Amino acid sequence: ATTTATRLTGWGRTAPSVANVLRTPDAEMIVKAVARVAESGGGRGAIARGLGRSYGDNAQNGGGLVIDMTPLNTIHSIDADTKLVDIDAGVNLDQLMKAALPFGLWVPVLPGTRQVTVGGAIACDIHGKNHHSAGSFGNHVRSMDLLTADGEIRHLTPTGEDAELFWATVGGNGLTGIIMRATIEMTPTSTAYFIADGDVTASLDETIALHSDGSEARYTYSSAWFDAISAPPKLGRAAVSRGRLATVEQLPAKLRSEPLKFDAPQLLTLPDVFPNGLANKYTFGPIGELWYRKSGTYRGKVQNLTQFYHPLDMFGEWNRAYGPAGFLQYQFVIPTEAVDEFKKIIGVIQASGHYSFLNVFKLFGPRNQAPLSFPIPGWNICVDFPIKDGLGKFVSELDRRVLEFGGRLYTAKDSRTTAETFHAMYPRVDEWISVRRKVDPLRVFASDMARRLELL
Numbered sequence: 001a002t003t004t005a006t007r008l009t010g011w012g013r014t015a016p017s018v019a020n021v022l023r024t025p026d027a028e029m030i031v032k033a034v035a036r037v038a039e040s041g042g043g044r045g046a047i048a049r050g051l052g053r054s055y056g057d058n059a060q061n062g063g064g065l066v067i068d069m070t071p072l073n074t075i076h077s078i079d080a081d082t083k084l085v086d087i088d089a090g091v092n093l094d095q096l097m098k099a100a101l102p103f104g105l106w107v108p109v110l111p112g113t114r115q116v117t118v119g120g121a122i123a124c125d126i127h128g129k130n131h132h133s134a135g136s137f138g139n140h141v142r143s144m145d146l147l148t149a150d151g152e153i154r155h156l157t158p159t160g161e162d163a164e165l166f167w168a169t170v171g172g173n174g175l176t177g178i179i180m181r182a183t184i185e186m187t188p189t190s191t192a193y194f195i196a197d198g199d200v201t202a203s204l205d206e207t208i209a210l211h212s213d214g215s216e217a218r219y220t221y222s223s224a225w226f227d228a229i230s231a232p233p234k235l236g237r238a239a240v241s242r243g244r245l246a247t248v249e250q251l252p253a254k255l256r257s258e259p260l261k262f263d264a265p266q267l268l269t270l271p272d273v274f275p276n277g278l279a280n281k282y283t284f285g286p287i288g289e290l291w292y293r294k295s296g297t298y299r300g301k302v303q304n305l306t307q308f309y310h311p312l313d314m315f316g317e318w319n320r321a322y323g324p325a326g327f328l329q330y331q332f333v334i335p336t337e338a339v340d341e342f343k344k345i346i347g348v349i350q351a352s353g354h355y356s357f358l359n360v361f362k363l364f365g366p367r368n369q370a371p372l373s374f375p376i377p378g379w380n381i382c383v384d385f386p387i388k389d390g391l392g393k394f395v396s397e398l399d400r401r402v403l404e405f406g407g408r409l410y411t412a413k414d415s416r417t418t419a420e421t422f423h424a425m426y427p428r429v430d431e432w433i434s435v436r437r438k439v440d441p442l443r444v445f446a447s448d449m450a451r452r453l454e455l456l
């Protein structure tokens with residue numbers, strides 16, 4: 001319906017740029033705009049935008065066009081027999097999860113928030129708590145319809161012709177065109193619940209040992225919080241949450257009558273029940289230690305999505321802190337075999353004088369064939385630093401460390417890394433760029449990130 005000049009940032013609310021934002025529920029209108037941008041030969045180009053949950057500058061285009069895809073949110077079909085869903089790129093994973101449950105179907109890859117679009121999920125090739133067993137979002141896309149620079153709509157599949165373009169679009173950050181529509185293969189489920197095992201470790205060595213002892217193959221889902229502030233040996237201690245989807249006979253009789261129902265997110269969160277924090281005189285001593293170890297250690301606990309998958313939700317408004325501004329989100333992965341190198345990076349972080357509380361630790365499994373896919377088999381870490389003197393130059397050093405240890409950064413979280421660091425981290429970038437130049441010779445699709453990371 002409308003085109004509007006708008007100041008656009010990522011979720012991190014940093015590096016703002018003004019673009020013409022097109023918001024239409026009409027698909028033929030989206031096709032026309034891309035054809036109009038291409039008629040000039042790609043003036044300053046266009047880029048799709050979803051829900052803006054990426055922290056960086058991948059979903060903005062200063063002095064150019066941004067197409068909002070959220071109004072394109074029709075669920076065309078769900079089929080329980082073939083396990084397939086046909087949805088527009090603008091549907092979000094919360095919406096899809098809600099719609100698919102009554103069929104006994106599960107969204108195969110869920111990120112730490114359900115507010116992301118299908119287009120957004122494919123474009124960043126998002127990963128979730130179950131990566132080691134299921135791969136990333138791209139692994140589960142059976143087909144997609146891509147609007148290219150030439151104004152045509154190409155029907156892509158993971159195998160067969162245009163496979164190269166499919167796998168370039170996966171993790172392509174919108175730089176091969178606009179995903180309009182997609183078929184996802186879902187995971188069959190009989191309940192909307194998990195069976196969980198909790199474990200708490202005392203150190204980083206202990207956290208690594210737990211992930212290396214072969215136990216990870218017993219759980220489809222697995223992730224941890226870790227201590228990034230304490231000095232060794234407390235550095236790297238973890239609360240690990242692992243589990244699998246439950247069967248209906250594994251549910252208590254109470255919940256057996258509605259196995260696939262989703263519980264309404266509660267009104268009262270912890271900040272509302274305890275306004276003045278959780279800490280008491282015991283918290284930071286040996287009794288405090290024992291309490292966390294006991295509460296974080298359990299076997300066969302039945303949990304809903306909110307409990308098992310979104311454990312930050314109970315903590316309400318407290319620590320993000322004031323928002324995602326002003327904090328710098330930083331995520332990387334170090335190859336599995338590089339255990340000593342990974343241990344070094346963690347030590348570098350704690351000695352930096354930059355303090356992160358909100359921490360994710362997860363061991364990734366095998367990678368996919370997308371040349372710009374973020375995930376590789378290894379140690380995935382997410383940290384959250386308050387913007388503060390010396391931070392920029394510190395994370396540049398972290399970049400060097402990650403790069404040197406065979407790892408990489410994640411575009412969905414980045415806003416500040418250099419093109420050189422990035423290109424070295426992604427050794428298949430030239431291969432990907434070649435594909436991009438075949439499908440968009442005029443640079444009809446472009447973004448701040450494309451220009452910054454020299455993927456243009």
Ligand SMILES: Cc1cc2nc3c(=O)[nH]c(=O)nc-3n(C[C@H](O)[C@H](O)[C@H](O)COP(=O)(O)OP(=O)(O)OC[C@H]3O[C@@H](n4cnc5c(N)ncnc54)[C@H](O)[C@@H]3O)c2cc1C
Pocket residue numbers: 011047048049050051052053054055058059069089090110111112113115116117118119120121123124125126127128129172173174175177178179180412
């Ligand atoms: C609280 C929080 C938790 C998170 N947890 C995780 C996690 O556990 N795992 C993980 O992998 N990520 C995570 N993320 C990052 C998030 O999953 C990605 O940034 C995701 O891509 C956001 O989707 P979106 O619809 O908001 O896309 P946007 O941020 O709006 O766009 C991001 C990129 O996708 C492209 N894009 C969007 N729609 C389309 C389309 N229709 N066609 C072509 N390209 C398109 C854009 O061009 C842009 O390059 C998290 C983010 C937040 C804020």
Ligand SMILES: N#Cc1ccc(CNc2nc3cc(C(F)(F)F)ccc3nc2C(=O)O)cc1
Pocket residue numbers: 111112113127128129130222223224225311312329357358359360361362380382
């Ligand atoms: N402490 C803590 C904590 C921090 C973040 C979250 C949920 N957010 C995320 N959770 C994430 C979870 C993973 C996982 F590895 F588990 F898949 C990977 C990346 C993630 N990224 C984010 C993000 O905020 O960008 C939950 C608890």
Ligand SMILES: C[C@H](CO)OC[C@@H](C)OC[C@@H](C)O
Pocket residue numbers: 112128129223224225239240241308309310311359360361
């Ligand atoms: C988002 C992710 C669950 O998919 O959470 C990871 C960390 C915070 O573990 C959860 C509990 C043990 O804190």
